[PDB]
Each structure stands twice: as structure tokens, then as C-alpha cells.
Amino acid sequence: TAEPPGSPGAAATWTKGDKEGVGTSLNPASKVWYTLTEGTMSEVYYPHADTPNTRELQFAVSDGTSAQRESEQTTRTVELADPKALSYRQTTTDNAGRWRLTKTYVTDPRRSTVMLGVTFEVLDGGDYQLFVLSDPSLAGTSGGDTGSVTDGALLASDLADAATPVATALVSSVGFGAVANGYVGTSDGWTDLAADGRLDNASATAGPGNISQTGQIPLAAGGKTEFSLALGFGADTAEALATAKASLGTGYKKVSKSYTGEWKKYLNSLDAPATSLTGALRTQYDVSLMTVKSHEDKTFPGAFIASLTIPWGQAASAETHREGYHAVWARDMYQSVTALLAAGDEEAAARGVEWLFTYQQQPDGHFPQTSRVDGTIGQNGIQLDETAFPILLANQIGRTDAGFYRNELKPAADYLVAAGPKTPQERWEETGGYSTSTLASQIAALAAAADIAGKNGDAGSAAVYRATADEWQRSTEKWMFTTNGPVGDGKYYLRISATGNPNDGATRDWGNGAGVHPENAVLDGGFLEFVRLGVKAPADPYVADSLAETDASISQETPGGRMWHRYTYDGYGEKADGSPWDGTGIGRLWPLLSGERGEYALANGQDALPYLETMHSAANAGYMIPEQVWDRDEPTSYGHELGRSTGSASPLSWAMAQYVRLAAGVKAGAPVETPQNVAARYAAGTPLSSPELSVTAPEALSTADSATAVVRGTTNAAKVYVSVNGTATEAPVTDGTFSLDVALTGAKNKVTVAAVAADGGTAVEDRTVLYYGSRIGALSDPAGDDNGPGTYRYPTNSAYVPGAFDLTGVDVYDAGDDYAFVATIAGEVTNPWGGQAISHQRVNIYLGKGEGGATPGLPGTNINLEHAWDSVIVTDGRFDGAGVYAPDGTRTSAVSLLAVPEARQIVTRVPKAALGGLDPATARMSVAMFGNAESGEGIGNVRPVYDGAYWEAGDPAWIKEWRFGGGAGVFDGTIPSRDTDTDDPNALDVLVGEGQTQAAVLDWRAGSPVVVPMLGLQP
Ligand SMILES: [Ca+2]
Ligand SMILES: [Ca+2]
Ligand SMILES: [Ca+2]
Ligand SMILES: [Ca+2]
Ligand SMILES: [Ca+2]
Ligand SMILES: [Ca+2]
16 A cells, blocks of 8 residues: 555644633533634544544645645634534634635534534635645544545544544535545645645555545635535544534534534523623633533543643643543542532532542542543542542532442541541642641541531541541641741741641742742642631631732732732743743643632622632633633743733633632622531531540550550540541540550551540540550560670661661560561661661571570571570561571571561561471570671671771771671681671670670670570560
8 A cells, every 4th residue: 555655744742721612512422522722623532531532623725826724824713603502613814815714613412523614705806725634643642543535534543442442534514625644744734735735645545653634625616615524433434434424414503503502401401690790701601611511521421521631732742642631630520510519510410429439439448649531540649638529529419328428438538537637749739748728628528527427327437537627627727827937927827838837947849840948938828728618717817817928929910800829939830931831830820719719708708709800801712711821921932911821721620610619609698619517617606615635545656465455544525436447436434534445457557536525526636556466475675775795886887877776675476377576676767778678687586495505596696595496587688588597597487577667666477387386475585686798798697796996997998887896806808707706796786684784695705605595575
């Protein structure tokens, strides 16, 4: 087969996020969504709202000598063709006024076809040729497409993905004259026409690769010709052609009417907006409502993508699958259904809630950062507000049935309780810690979950959720309201704190090229979520002092009204020269924040209409509200306009949604999505008492001795509930005291203690309990003991953190099939040299029965044990040198090493069988801590100790840098010991029993090798 020149086609990109309009039928049968960009049709989605298939479809007109692209005509307009439907009309006029093209878009509600009603008028003596230029990017990729011709139609496909096969068919109601396929940048229609105003390439086939199709439209005799084009989609070519023809078969006028009628009927069936919405604000409402609606998938009803666009797509390559904003974000979806809910579309919210918990929720209960419309995980960051919003959606909708509560709601709420108040990522998806914005959703979600749990008879989980939410709610100011910020009076809620001390001036890099700034200096309107979600009263005083400074720092007055940047120094936007964001740049204005300020104003009884006015001034002629609008008077080399959409997403369903939701709030006189049960508790009048609660045991962190742990203390509350990892059990209160042996359910047990007063007030306490099984026995050892006989020194190198070789205890647990030998150290448990759990420590635990007398330990050890040993446990996560060893050096069994730095523990799992019938419960044992080393550094992988003075000298340098000092001897590379004196023990410390001391037991000058006492585990 002869392919036209250009293979495989030029590298391509997507389109700018700034859309003039978008559209889809209300009918779920039509699996197509179209977008418009600068006078052309940009990306069209199919079969799911998360898959773009087009880059550009526009017309070219020639006289026979020269040709022009309508995207080159400085004179073109866009306008919504119907005030009650998502149908747009683009008009292109020749710069010389010789011809005029009029295009009106619509889709066939019954099948996946995008239709274009076209009128071409020659205003000259005539004699012009008209060509359609359709450049696809099927299945979300510019490459991999194959263009062909059949039965007078232009065909294209990319079936490289079995789960998402895509093919199209461009058909002309009047057929085509000349038809051609080629490779972009060489044999494509425009490159061709530009050459000589003629279609020289006649090749009817091209690809796979980046191709484009071109079809000449036969013009009627006279000035104007009216016709229509149908772009049908299908799993295959035959399906696509058939769908397109079925559309033309019905006709543009008929299809147009049907499409426009569904939308009109949809709007007319929903709640009537406030009478105070003037014409323009009403149309903005109608278009915003439909647009939000159009972001729901047709194959997975209930799934809403953030936006049918790719921000800065002109700079985003299309060779590989990209996510853009055409993916599902729980947060953005929450904004969407909450808007449809405000407008009166209950079913969309029901499908939505069902979709979230069925398809996107993860087995652990939380919601992924992003996902495909089928639930397939996209980004994997942890945003706690994305787990809280779906709970709030179910709370609002009443989706509270026992089954849904136990299997859906509880796991999500339990995750929140387990995650703690700090979110690893806040709503802007960039950093973590105590977030005003996220903590507001966390508190509201748990407060709501509490009522749902209670309503379902689960008092334990209710107390846990309420007590937790209550504590975070009363800690809002302590954690995030700074009092020494470098702006205004210095008193305001900051954006996020890493420590929970808003006055510590802790810094961090804020990404996107913003650099390092103290948290004290970063202002963010996220605190407004507190009143919006009923977490604080509308007139809360703290939210009030945040206003002035926040406005000064990130607000600005545009001609349409006041607007806000997300936060101080935000760099997520175009660069100073106007070029698209590419990892760094400068954040612009977010119109949705005006809608947010408006809900806060409304909640306080003020007129919110002006905020709607401001939100609408950010829209284009098509009424598309963008994520961002330019904030400078200077239009860089790019055509940026103050108050107009930038290169990012437009429309942003979220911004569209925020406009509708506020509008509804205006009609009701108060924000309509605020959770009533949550506001009743925190935003109403009279506050509640907080009962006293004192948990005396356990401590913040501990290790249990069995499958149960004693949880006790004092309180003046009526009831107390002790919950571990989501399992709550009541603790009966007796004369202000309580005490319960609660069951441990995991290796790590998060224990929440909730105290509930007779009037409803709560107090909470959290404790963490580590569990390895029933404790056989233990051995203790003093800290600051890591100096051998009392003269040893750590090797100067940094890696050797202090206390690394300082044992503080040894605990043995019966762990079912294994024995868990837990060693605790004073120093931090590191693992830099990349090893199993640890790198530096080499502890030995010689097990025996106290028989015989002095018996040598392992080779490079340089020590003896008080009595004979049957086996020794080597804890060395280096060189696979760990396990239980017989006295002859034979490793009788492998072992697993786990590090628990939080507890400064080093766990060694030893299968019971490894200790051939030697029960540690009645065995004698010696414990010694050495430093691991390479064979070439000393016998048996033990880092030797050398003369103190010799070491102090530092000759060579590696001795005082990577070896122990204060013992005896110098380096000798001729013998395996590498030490010229192995009389001194290489143990930096060991365990001794009563009446004896480490200084005497390790005193090698008074005897060598030293004899380490054989001890017994105390129960
Ligand atoms: Ca492709
Ligand atoms: Ca292409
Ligand atoms: Ca689920
Ligand atoms: Ca010690
Ligand atoms: Ca030595
Ligand atoms: Ca010791």
C-alpha cells in the first residue's frame, strides 16, 4: 500500500484549556461530548467523559490560488445558539469580507454523533472551494490513527487498546468533492492547501501515526450553500459510519430540535431560580447548570469528571495517554452534585453517592486522589477532604441505611479517625499538615458520621466520631490561627501548619516555583469552609479577623468585582511572560473563590448577588466560567485579558457548580448545602460542656503484654467508649473512674477513648498500642550504656547516630508460629546503608539452659558467655547474616527483621521450630550489641574496637571514622581479625543481672575474654 509522505506524522500537543463552549445531550445514549476552541471544534470525548479523541476540526477556503483557515480570521464570534441548551454557533468572516462561515453545534441524543449545521456564504463574485479539516487524536493519543475513505465518508480508527477501541466517520449531508488523508506537517490537508490553494494529495489512506483528514464540500450554485456534517463514533469503523449516517438520516434540524428540547425540558423541570437573577445572571445559571450536568459520565452514571479539558493543552504532548482534568476528583464531584442538589436534581446525587462508594472507594475505606470513570485509580495522593466529602454527600442525601453504613460509611469514617487531623495533601493537592480547608471537611464529615452511626444503633462508633470531631473543632484556632503573622494585625488563620503551632514560623517550599516561605506568611481563604460546612458560626470571630489580612494578601479588585488568588506566592499559573505553566509560574485569580466568599456573606445575611455578578464577569460569550482569569493589566505576547479566562480549565465544573450553588443559596437566604446536623452542633447558639477525661494507662505509646490492654482513668462523663482500630466497646463508669481490658486487633492498635457527658459534650484521648503477642518475659538495660567497659567510642561518621548501639531492653513474645524477639534502643533506628530494617546494629542473643561454664561466643565477638548455649539469634539486616545459628556456625534457620522506629524497636521474628524445643520462657540467655561489618573488616561481620589513643590520633583516617575506639590494638590487614589485639570485647554493651555491673563484666584488663552473664526472662 502506497502511503502519502510524512509518516509517522509530526509530534502533536492537545489544545488550550480555555473553551468557548462545550456540549452533550441529556440522553445517556449519545456517548459524545464536544468542546470548542478559538473558532474550531477542539476535543470530543467518547465513549467515556474521560477520553478525548480530537484536536481540531475547522474549515479552509480557497479561491484556487490561495487558501485560508478560519482560525486565521481575526474576525469570528461565538454565542450560545439557544438560551436553554448547550448548542453554540461560531461565525467566521473573511478578513476581507468576501465569505462568511456559520457553524452551529449539537449532538444526536440517540447516538454517539456530533453534528454541525453549516452555512457558507460567498459575498464576492464567487468561485471558492470549501474544505473540512479534521485532525483526530483517537483514544487519547495523536499517534496510532489510521485514516481511510469508504462510501463517500472519511474514516479513522485506533484499536490499539482492546478496552477502548475508537473509530470515527465524518459524513457530509451533501457528500464530499475531493477527499484525502495524510500525515500532519507534511501531507495533511492544510499543509497541502497552503502550498497552492489546491488539494494535491489524493491519498485515500494514511497511518498508523499522526494523521488528519480533509474533505471538500460541494458548494451550491449561487452565493450560499447550506449543509451539515456528522461525526459519528463507534467501537469500529462500520459502527461509526452507521451512527453518522443514522444522524444525517434524521437530519440536522430534527436532531437539533431533539437535543435542544431535552435540555429545555431538563431546566424547566428543576427548581426555579431566584427571581432576582437578571437576564444575564439567569442565562449564566442555566448554562452553568447544564454544564455541570454534562460532566456526568453516560456509562457509569454518578461519575463526574472535573472538566472536559487539558489545561495548557497546547503545551501538553498527546503522544502518550494524559489525564488532564478529564478524570474524577471526589472533591470536584462533591462540588458538582452539591450544585445539582441545590438546583433540585436529586437522582444525580443518588447515582453519585452510589458510584463513589461502589467504584472509587478503596478497600481501606479512603478515596483515591483521582480515578477514571470506572473507578480505576489515577493519581494516588492522600487528600482527606476527598474521603470526607463523599460522607457529607451521603449525609446530605440521607443515604444512611444500615447496610450502606456498615459497609460503606463506617470504613470511610474509620479511615478519617485513623488518619488523624493532619492531611498529607490539602485541596490544592500540594502539601500537608493541619489544613483549615481540609480539617473543616474532616470535622463536618465525622460529626455527620456520628449522627449516622447513632441513627443506626452503633453508639460506640458514634462516640468515637463525635468525640474526635469535637476535639478537632475546638482545636481549630490553636492549630491554625496565627497571632504573629507578618501581615496586618498579625492575627488570622494561615493556610496550613506542619506542627500545629501557627506562631512557630515554620517554613517549607510551597512548590510551583514559589520557593520557601514561613507558614505564617501564607494566607488562604480555605478557612471560609468552616462556616460553609457549619463547623463554626457564620459570625465566628476568628474567621472574621482572617478577612482583612487575607484580602490584603491575595485579593484584588477587577472590573467585574473582587477576586482572590488561592494563596500567597501561589505559582500554579502562567509564567511572567504569559507562557503556560510547566511546573512553575504564577497562580492567577480563581473566580470560584468569589462564589465562596459570597456563601460566607450570605450566611451572615448579606446580599450575595454581587458575588454572582463577579463570577459571571469571568465568563466568556459562551458563559463558560474558568478555573482562572488573568490578573494583570498587561497582555503579554499571548492574548491575555484582565478578568478573562487563562490557559487552564474552562469550563471548570467546580466553578460552574459554585455559581449555581450560590444562586440557590440566594433564593433560600442561606447556603443550601451546609450540613444542618453539623451546624446545629457547632454553628448554632448555646455551646456544650466538655467533660473531664484523664486516661492514666496506657501511655501515648506502648507495647502490650497480651491480646488485651488495660485502658483506664478518670472522668465526670456519663459514658465512656474505648475503641481500637474501629472496634468500640463501652467502659462502664463507676464513681468517676473506668477500667477496661480491651481486645487488640492488629500489630499496631490506634485506641480512641471517647467520654460522653449527659448533655452531649465530649472529650477524647488517643493511645497507640503495639502488639506482638503474649509476652514471655523481658530484660531491661540502662540508657547511656553504649560505651563497652566504659571507654568505647562511636565511629565519628554521621551515620552512627547516638544511642544506635545502646540497648534499653529485650522483650520476647509468643507470636503464634514465631517468637518475636524485640530489642529496644535509646537511639533512633536508622537504615541508611540500605539493609533489611537496620544497617549498623549486630545484636547477639545466646540461648541456653545455664549448663557448664564459660563458653565462647561467635568468632569476631571476643567474648565468652557465663554458660553454654545451644543456639544464638543474630539480628543483622546486612549481608543476609541474620538467623539462628548453632555453635558450629551453621545457620539452622532464617529470621525476619522488622524496624519500628516510632518505638525505637528492632523486631526479629524467629520461627518456634528454629529453637529446637528450647522454650525461651525458661531458657537462659546472654545479650550483646556489636556493630555489623564486612568480612574484610573483621571476622564474623563484627566491627572491631582498637586502642583509645591510637584511635584518637586518626592515623589513618578511616579508623577514627569507621571503627570503634577505646579498647586495645591497631589495624592489621594480614589476619582475619584485622585487630592486633582481640582481648578487648567488641561489644558496645550487654545485659547484666543483679549484683553485677557492665564495668566489671566487660573489664577485659582483669580477665579475657570477658564472661557475659547468662540471664533469665522476667515475666
Ligand atoms: Ca490515537
Ligand atoms: Ca492527528
Ligand atoms: Ca466501597
Ligand atoms: Ca544500654
Ligand atoms: Ca581490640
Ligand atoms: Ca548494659
